[PDB]
């Protein structure tokens, strides 16, 4: 599977960041992937036409893709994930379980807050839990992930103003 997965390329096969098709003409990815020059591999080969906040980045694609079975978008969930929920991180798929935020507070050198969630067991890629996108990929330490539920509106807004 993973029909929502996309690759951001630098000139010409310099693979570097992942992205997730959230709507048929829209990708979501992490902020540190802000290159002012990239191409998109979704298969189809596209170009950015708009890029955005300091936590995630929205990319508007030159073409709206017709939802297929090999390429289809994934909905961004408004329900925040609860500890114990099992999810999968792809970008080669690993299984993980949401943890308490204090596991990440106790282990990380910086402050952790609501806009992230804590998860782990045994960039720009997706964390899918109940079949919907709930996070983005930001030693034996738990991972921190962007809590997309707290951003569901900033994307909606950002889409209306670039549509």
């Amino acid at each position, epitope marked *: 599977t993973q029909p929502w997965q996309a690759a951001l390329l630098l000139r010409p096969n310099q693979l570097y960041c992942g992205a997730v098709l959230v709507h048929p003409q829209w990708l979501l990815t992490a902020a540190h992937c802000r290159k002012k020059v990239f191409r998109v591999r979704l298969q189809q080969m596209f170009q950015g036409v708009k890029s955005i906040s300091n936590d995630l980045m929205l990319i508007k694609l030159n073409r709206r893709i017709r939802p297929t079975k090999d390429v289809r978008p994934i909905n961004v969930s408004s329900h925040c994930p*609860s*500890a*114990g929920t099992k999810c999968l991180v792809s970008g080669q798929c690993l299984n993980i379980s949401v943890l*308490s*935020q*204090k*596991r990440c*507070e*106790d*282990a*990380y*050198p*910086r*402050q*952790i*807050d*609501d806009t992230m969630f804590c998860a782990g067991d045994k960039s720009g890629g997706p964390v899918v839990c109940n079949g919907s996108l709930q996070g983005l990929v930001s030693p034996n330490r738990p991972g921190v992930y962007t809590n997309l539920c707290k951003f569901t509106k900033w994307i909606q807004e950002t889409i209306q103003a670039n549509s």
Partner: antibody
Framework: EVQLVESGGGLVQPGGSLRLSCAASGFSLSSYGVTWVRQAPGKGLEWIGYITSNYGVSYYASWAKSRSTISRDTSKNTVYLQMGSLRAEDMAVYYC?????????????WGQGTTVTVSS | AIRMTQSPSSFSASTGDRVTITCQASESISNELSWYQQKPGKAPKLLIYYASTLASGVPSRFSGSGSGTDFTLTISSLQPEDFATYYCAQGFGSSGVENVFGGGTKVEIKR
């Protein structure tokens, strides 16, 4: 034995500063975070904040962030609470307590409590 | 922004009775919930953690239940030395929190 011994609670005049020490014996601050909680006479438990075990990151109650600091001396295995601009509302018994991650960070070992009186 | 609330503020029952007191989280905290007993003039003591596992030395008449937002502490048979105030505390997250503790429930004994 795990033990948290507190010191530094006394009579402070209004607008003064409090400095409190929580000296940990029987365990290492690099393995256990420590919390500060206070209690006014006849009232409930009021969390002030805590400092993590690994990098010593401080988390504060929203009401406490602007005036409080929680810090760690790893060589003395001692945790500190500092507070300025003291008012009547800060008169309280101040406890420190250890967070045990195996019990999901529950507070399993408490200090004896040190009393801070804001008076002139 | 997790808020914890306890109910009732005051609980009176008779010796030997079953006692049930509640605690609620404004958002899900899974089972990261702990219960503390504070006898008069003493530091609080941990009774229950992970919502339902008894700490060493806690009398078996204590038990705790729940997961998510609604939690229960229970005393199967109220003994005199159970006179105290009971607090719950979430250990799910620390950011944007006013207080990790609930307001407490004072247990009073009718004899």
């Amino acid at each position: 034995e795990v033990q948290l011994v507190e010191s530094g609670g006394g009579l402070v005049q209004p607008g003064g500063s409090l400095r409190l020490s929580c000296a940990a014996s029987g365990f290492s601050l690099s393995s256990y975070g420590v919390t500060w909680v206070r209690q006014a006479p006849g009232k409930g438990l009021e969390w002030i904040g805590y400092i993590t075990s690994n990098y010593g990151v401080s988390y504060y109650a929203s009401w406490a962030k602007s005036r409080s600091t929680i810090s760690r001396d790893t060589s003395k295995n001692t945790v500190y609470l500092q507070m300025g601009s003291l008012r009547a509302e800060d008169m309280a018994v101040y406890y420190c307590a250890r967070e045990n991650p195996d019990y999901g960070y529950a507070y399993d070992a408490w200090g004896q409590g040190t009393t801070v009186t804001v008076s002139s | 922004a997790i808020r914890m609330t306890q109910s009732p503020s005051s609980f009176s029952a008779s010796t030997g009775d079953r006692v049930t007191i509640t605690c609620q989280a404004s958002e899900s905290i899974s089972n990261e919930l702990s219960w503390y007993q504070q006898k008069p003039g003493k530091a609080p003591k941990l009774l229950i953690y992970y919502a339902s596992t008894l700490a060493s030395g806690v009398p078996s008449r204590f038990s705790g239940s729940g997961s998510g937002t609604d939690f229960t502490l229970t005393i199967s048979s109220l003994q005199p030395e159970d006179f105290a105030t009971y607090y719950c505390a979430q250990g799910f997250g620390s950011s944007g929190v006013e207080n990790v503790f609930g307001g407490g429930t004072k247990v009073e004994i009718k004899r």
